[PDB]
Write a protein that binds this DNA or RNA. Structure first.
Ligand code: DCP
Ligand code: CA
Ligand code: CA
Ligand code: CA
Lengths: 918, 362, 347
DNA sequence: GCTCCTCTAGACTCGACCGC
DNA sequence: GCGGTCGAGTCTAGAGGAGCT
């Protein structure tokens, strides 16, 4: 219940059934060195209050130690799928048939090429490639697949029949049926595209079919970092993610023909219905290349990723599942409507700014306006070439007046043939205002927009209190990247706006994505600042509304919803339920970190961002709870235990381990708050800097980041700050820093002949080994060690959670893993059993991470989840109400989502009596 | 200068300065709206009526008396008969138009609406009167929440359509005595937010105490949404919103401004120019453009003061007919928004004004 | 009879929806012809309740707050019986608007409460502030102008009549009449009240109570009953051939000879409504052509538009006129302009 | 640390057409 | 015959990727 460093280790009730009885005790010299290191930084001698002890009857761990237990778990998980991978690796394939069948469902052609009526491939291993016409819709057109000793093809009813009555509503009956009504492996290149077009994968209950991706395995084996990808377009051992280049790298020989007749990205239904027999040939050759490179990759992957936990986690990391309801269409509709409404409001504010800007013409006041002085204000002249009255007198006067008016309306003989266009308005205005003769004319500056070189002058935008100025030579700057002398504004220094590509480029829009964090409207008028607020509110949806609106939702009918939904009283017959299967590549980086642009992001709901509640729109169906638990400082703890194992055999022997364990955010004693206090920056930027430093980002990166976050910091001051901020943690080589042993272990395990993840032993990419790439990309290797250890953590969590769900019969399913978060779609009754399962999984995973490092112990601090958020919609905290400019009334008021409960280990034990049985 | 001083000077507001207090304005116990104020309120009522009954299907018109048969409502006591008999058979002034709408319930589809604009009497005891525009929307019970949400955003869009600053027209949520749900629009007046419009998802109760007899008269017995906006308070909201809170100008929407054209005459000869201007005025009125005759005004003033006066009165366009108009037909048209002077030919003036006022409304 | 036809076609309830629309049209015509076309006539808004006099002789109902009998006739407000007193309180209010240049006018269409119970009538009042010397001249001018206004919209201007009478104080005044089938009922009345009426509402300084000289105007009151006037126009127009500037519904769309026709009618209706033409959307009805003709005739619909399959083939819509009961073909794009031209020419 | 692809929109330049 | 006006042409900066469609 304590260690030689007074850190409360695990309770004897759990420790005696997790770690070894005899184990090993640290020596006197090791403990003395650890105590000296802790006392050097002042962290030794600061005891903390003890957490209440936990007494659980853990499930009987298999094997002898934790390592054998996991290995057996992962082997039993990925046994039937590695068999299918091996079956596909060694096979004999008949040649691609010359012709293909114009059927409505699946087709199979063998040696005889018979027109075989197929609905299900009925095979455990099928390479795949789905072809979808982008213009017509996201529904598949056709697909060609191969299983050993077979060739497969399926074409949608949208081609065999030529009617155009196709709705935008998506149902699973429009997709590819693969699964049988047991274990199966379906392979492809970018399978996340194929899986999203499969029918049986849009079901709330889990699926026993797992998907393996050639792109992911390639990225694991011989992947390229983004800089290496740029340099590629080690060169003979790696390639870019495209199928042709990968096939050239691994298999080689006759290159794959990229079709220039792009009848799937810029084509129609007829273009495909005509060149069917050639588009299928191209798809078949793509499938053949994928199969050949899979043959060349699978042995390499199993050699370089030996631990079964890696493959098991990859097989379970790529079955993500995000349920939705009819509120998704309300989210999209309301977000787009608010985007259009705020765009109209911003345009009207811009037109009002323009109208209030003309009045500078009166008296030539524009010559002193700091923003509109350099525009064109020129004017043009026209051209050309007592008592009442009697009824009779009134009629005569009316007739005389009308006659005089009609006589005056006949002098059009002098006006010119082509009417002038607003000669009375100033020069820069006539461009804005449409042509008076246009059939689509609207009044005022109806052509004004944000992108014009006028808008950041009508808004009177000020960068740090400095008006924005445009120069043809340099671009958008400001007046008071250096004082360029090309611009000769009297008494002003033209400093360019900083650009993401350095000071050698030009800026053409001070409303670009790079400038959102910084830049405010200047003098009086509540329409400029309002326009800027509209811009900031819309920015997210503007830059990411194509992706979100195009997400391939599939609404299930009542014919496929679980019984645990229809019987639940919260279910209504007038609501459409479905799911979104994120198109995420399991290993989208050299790290093997999954990559997806929309779902897997750190952005969360905000009160100042239209459509930012998208994750909150993942609302579990009635009867299900999105039981999840963000891992409490995952990668920091991972690096901490790495450093602890390198330094000694016990937790907290390094200052970083103590700060991770014993430091708390309440007192500001944790890493992030300590860094913020030492430097003087906010916690949000300190988090980014710290996590970047853990990734091996060098001091110049820190200097540039400190300049970027705080532009008041010069180059020399930022360099000094970053040097002081790294010397205290990294050290001098290192020795003397809180993360000296951590970084030393990272470098030692990155500089080995075959770098391995210290937990699961997976190998780094062939393009980053010290033999192929020599001593290049040290930052990339150091980042890979920690981030791939985090991926191994996720793999261990997924394996353990699947084991717990299968053993104790929990009606759950993996939902998504957005960065370190892990969400499960557990049924409502099991929300406490699943919470206990998540606590046990965290305990076992931390113990495995410490055991594979030789620590052979675990503190009580990190032994359990701080809070297992039992909820019904994804959100950082269960108290959030998701108020956004598109959701002003909140989540509970509008969408009727009651708040959930963030439990704790003690409460979980009190609810479940400590047992996961039913 | 405060807005209320301007709206009192330019005859948007009438009454003694003791009646220009905030509570007096927001109570309705005195005739607050001057001529231009009444015209702007008529424009607001016209926009409401078109957008709710003309541009909207399934919404009709209702006529209701100013006296409810048989509460804090004032009583009507005949002085010919002049305490127990004054509170059992005496008539009572209406406090809301909701009970008038429920009288015209059928007189057979669903949903539908019964919209009305009229005067309602408020205890202040003194008597205050406010012009309430009520939409009583009937729905099946299940759809009531959805229809309430739709009406809330449609009314918010309508109120923000003419608004220079649409963000001020806020919204909220409220519950009544019986726990019924309902929203409440607002406008952020300089002193504080006031409920220019309220919506209450009245349940099945309302049709019970207006048709207490057979239930077949009231096939789902519909609920009531009771959308009710205060067009006096709305008019004051649009008078506060148009002002910037420079040049003093009420940037009222071209569909709400009371005066759209302001004719004038440059110089001599007086008779011919005035005859031409009268002919032009007769031409404008026939199409339906509200003109302000400034040529017949015997009080002569400089062009600057005339233009400032037209700005404050929210005059969209200012026309000047000078002696040169007799030669070729060029009239120095001016626009409130830009304050820039054209030289448009006579034959184009009416068509240009009609086109402008058709583009503004659409 | 006429009462049955008005009752069935929503003209009689008193005023059904079509009756209320016709009354709104009548009030709008009055407003235009007496305020917009007429110079120096303005709008007046005044509350329905009066400050309350001490004279028990008044028959106006009193306002008593239930939260609170011989004091009910002292400080309790009373409902207005005529708009005349409301106008006289705006004399100073609109005096600065005209820059104190006599003559000037005040007009208002409001509700008047008269003891029948309490009865409400919609009275459109014109109060003219004319000097004393020109009192009878302006009185006769307004008499003939109001008679022309009331005859203008009538198919039979002979039924409308005028006559004279004398006030209680010997003041002379003129009364307009309509010859209803049961006899004459005065739909309008003009009195030459004089400076006496303005004296009561302004007992204070005379200067705040005509060339260069200033005199207390010989206030004469022109008050018309637009409810009884609407009744007169419903009787006179009897198929009801109401005036085009008065009829509630101008166009009655429909379909004949499906969804494409629905969209065509929707676009036509939207264009007509945007222009400003009130339309009866007969294509939205649940379900003969002759029955529709009769219904649109009884409702006084100027033109019945029929959209058929030919409107897709040729773009020609059948147009039928209430006045002539004959069929005409016209292109869809020119229907709006034709209707606007017809309405302008009718006025 | 450093590039590549296409698609879109705003601005200076250019000659070709036209009414005085 | 010639100064004004108008419809491409060219250029450049930004923005989705560096994969599947
Ligand atoms: N500069 C950064 C910051 C974060 N991350 C990603 C990788 C990590 O897996 C995850 C960590 O985020 P946390 O939610 O763990 O952050 P904290 O928990 O430390 O934040 P706080 O303790 O303030 O809640 O974010 C990253 O890649 N780079
Ligand atoms: Ca693929
Ligand atoms: Ca392909
Ligand atoms: Ca975390």
């Amino acid at each position: 219940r304590h260690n030689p460093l007074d850190i409360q280790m695990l309770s004897r009730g759990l420790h005696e059934q997790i770690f070894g009885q005899g184990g090993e005790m640290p020596g006197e010299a090791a403990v003395r060195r650890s105590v000296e290191h802790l006392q050097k930084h002042g962290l030794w001698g600061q005891p903390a209050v003890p957490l209440p002890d936990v007494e659980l009857r853990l499930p009987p761990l298999y094997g002898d130690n934790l390592d054998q237990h996991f290995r057996l778990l992962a082997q039993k998980q990925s046994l039937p799928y590695l068999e299918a991978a091996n079956l596909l690796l060694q096979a004999q394939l008949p040649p691609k048939p010359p012709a293909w069948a114009w059927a409505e469902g699946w087709t199979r052609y063998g040696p005889e090429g018979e027109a075989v009526p197929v609905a299900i491939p009925e095979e455990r291993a099928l390479v795949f490639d789905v072809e979808v016409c982008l213009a017509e819709g996201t529904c598949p057109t056709l697909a060609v697949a191969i299983s050993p000793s077979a060739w497969y093809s399926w074409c949608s009813q949208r081609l065999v029949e030529e009617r155009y009555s196709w709705t935008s509503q998506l149902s699973p009956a429009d997709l590819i049926p693969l699964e049988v009504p047991q274990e199966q492996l379906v392979v492809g290149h970018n399978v996340s595209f194929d899986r999203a077009h499969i029918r049986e994968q849009y079901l709330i209950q889990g699926s026993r079919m797992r998907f393996l991706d050639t792109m992911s395995m390639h990225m694991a084996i011989s992947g390229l970092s983004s800089f290496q990808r740029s340099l590629w377009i080690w060169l003979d051992i790696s390639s870019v993610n495209s199928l042709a280049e990968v096939h050239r790298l691994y298999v080689g020989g006759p290159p794959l023909e990229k079709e220039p007749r792009e009848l799937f990205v810029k084509g129609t239904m007829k273009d495909i219905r005509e060149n069917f027999q050639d588009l299928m040939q191209y798809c078949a050759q793509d499938v053949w290349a994928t199969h050949e490179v899979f043959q060349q990759q699978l042995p390499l992957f199993l050699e370089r990723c030996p631990h079964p936990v890696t493959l098991a986690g990859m097989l379970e990391m790529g079955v993500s599942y995000l349920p939705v309801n009819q509120n998704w269409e309300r989210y999209l509709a309301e977000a787009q409507g608010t985007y259009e409404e705020l765009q109209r409001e911003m345009k009207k504010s811009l037109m009002d700014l323009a109208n209030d800007a003309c009045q500078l013409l009166s008296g030539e006041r524009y010559k002193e306006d700091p923003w509109l002085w350099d525009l064109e204000w020129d004017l043009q002249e026209f051209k050309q070439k007592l008592g009442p009255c009697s009824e009779e007198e009134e009629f005569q006067q009316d007739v005389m007046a009308r006659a005089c008016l009609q006589k005056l309306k006949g002098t059009t003989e002098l006006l010119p043939k082509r009417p002038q266009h607003l000669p009375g308005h100033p020069g820069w205005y006539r461009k804005l205002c449409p042509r008076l003769d246009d059939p689509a004319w609207t009044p005022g500056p109806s052509l004004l927009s944000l992108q014009m070189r006028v808008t950041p002058k009508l808004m009177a935008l000020t960068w740090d209190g400095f008006p924005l100025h445009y120069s043809e030579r340099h671009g958008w700057g400001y007046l008071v990247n250096g004082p360029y002398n090309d611009v000769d504004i009297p008494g002003c220094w033209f400093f360019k706006l900083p650009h993401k590509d350095g000071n050698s480029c030009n800026v053409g829009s001070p409303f670009a994505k790079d400038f959102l964090p910084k830049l405010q409207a200047g003098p009086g008028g509540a329409s400029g600042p309002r326009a800027l607020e509209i811009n900031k509110m819309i920015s997210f949806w503007r830059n990411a509304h194509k992706r979100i609106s195009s997400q391939m939702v599939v609404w299930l009918p009542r014919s496929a919803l679980p019984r645990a939904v229809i019987r639940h009283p919260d279910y209504d017959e007038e609501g459409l339920y479905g799911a979104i299967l994120p198109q995420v590549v399991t290993a989208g980086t050299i790290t093997r970190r999954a990559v997806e642009p929309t779902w897997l992001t750190a952005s969360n709901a905000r009160p100042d961002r239209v459509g930012s509640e998208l994750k909150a729109m993942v609302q579990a169906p009635p009867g299900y709870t999105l039981v999840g638990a963000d891992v409490d400082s995952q990668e920091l703890w991972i690096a901490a235990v790495l450093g602890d194992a390198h330094f000694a055999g016990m937790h907290g022997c390094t200052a970083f381990g103590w700060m991770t364990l014993q430091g708390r955010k309440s007192r500001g004693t944790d890493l992030h708050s300590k860094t913020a206090t030492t430097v003087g920056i906010s916690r949000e930027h300190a988090k980014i800097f710290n996590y970047g430093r853990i990734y091996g980002a060098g001091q110049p990166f820190a200097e540039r980041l400190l300049m970027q976050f705080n532009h008041r910091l010069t180059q020399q001051e930022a360099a000094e700050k970053a040097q002081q901020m790294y010397a205290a943690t990294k050290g001098l080589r290192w020795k003397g820093g809180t993360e000296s042993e951590m970084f030393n272990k990272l470098e030692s395990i990155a500089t080995s002949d075959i770098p391995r993840t210290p937990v699961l032993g997976c190998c780094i990419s062939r393009a980053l080994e010290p033999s192929a790439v020599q001593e290049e990309f040290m930052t990339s290797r150091v980042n890979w060690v920690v981030q791939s250890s985090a991926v191994d953590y996720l793999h261990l969590m997924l394996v353990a959670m699947k084991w717990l769900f299968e053993e104790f019969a929990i009606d759950g399913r993996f939902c998504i893993s957005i960065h370190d978060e892990v969400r499960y779609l557990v049924r409502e009754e099991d929300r406490y059993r699943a919470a206990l399962a998540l606590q046990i999984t965290n305990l076992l995973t931390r113990c495995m991470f410490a055991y594979k490092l030789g620590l052979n112990d675990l503190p009580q601090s990190v032994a359990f989840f701080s809070a297992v958020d039992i909820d019904r919609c994804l959100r950082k905290e269960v108290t959030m109400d998701c108020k956004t400019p598109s959701n002003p009334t909140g989540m509970e008021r509008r969408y009727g989502i009651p708040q959930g409960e963030a439990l704790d280990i003690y409460q979980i034990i009190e609810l479940t009596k400590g047992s996961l049985e039913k | 200068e405060a807005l209320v001083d301007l709206c009192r000077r330019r005859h948007f507001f009438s009454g003694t300065p003791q009646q220009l207090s905030t509570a007096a304005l927001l109570s309705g116990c005195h005739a607050r709206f001057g001529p231009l104020g009444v015209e702007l309120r008529k424009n607001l009522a016209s926009q409401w009526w078109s957008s709710m009954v003309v541009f909207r299907e399934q919404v009709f018109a209702v006529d209701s008396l100013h006296q409810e048969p048989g509460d804090s409502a004032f009583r009507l006591v005949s002085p010919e008969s002049i305490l127990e008999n004054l509170l059992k058979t005496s008539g009572k002034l209406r406090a809301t138009l909701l009970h008038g709408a429920l009288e015209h319930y059928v007189n057979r589809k669903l949903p539908f609406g019964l919209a009305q604009i009229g005067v309602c009497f408020h205890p202040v005891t003194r008597v205050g009167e406010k012009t309430e525009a009520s939409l009583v929307w009937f729905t099946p019970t299940r759809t009531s929440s959805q229809w309430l949400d739709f009406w809330l955003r449609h009314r918010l869009l309508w109120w923000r359509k003419f608004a220079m600053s649409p963000s001020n027209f806020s919204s909220a949520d409220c519950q009544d005595e019986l726990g019924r749900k309902g929203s409440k629009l607002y406008y952020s007046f300089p002193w504080g937010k006031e409920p220019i419009e309220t919506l209450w998802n009245l349940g099945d109760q309302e049709l019970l105490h207006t048709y207490p007899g057979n239930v077949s008269t009231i096939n789902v017995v519909p609920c009531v949404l009771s959308v009710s906006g205060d067009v006096d308070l709305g008019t004051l909201a649009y008078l506060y919103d148009s002002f910037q809170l420079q040049r003093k100008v009420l940037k009222l929407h071209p569909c709400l401004a009371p005066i759209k054209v302001a004719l004038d005459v440059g110089k001599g000869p007086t008779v011919e120019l005035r005859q031409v201007c009268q002919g032009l005025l007769n031409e404008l009125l026939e199409n339906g453009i509200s003109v302000w005759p400034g040529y017949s005004e015997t009080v002569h003033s400089s062009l600057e003061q005339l233009h400032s006066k037209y700005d404050e009165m929210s005059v969209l366009f200012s026309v000047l007919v000078t002696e040169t108009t007799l030669e070729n037909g060029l009239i120095q048209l001016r626009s409130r928004d830009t304050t820039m002077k054209e030289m448009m030919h006579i034959s184009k003036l009416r068509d240009f004004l009609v086109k402008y006022l058709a583009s503004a409304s659409n």
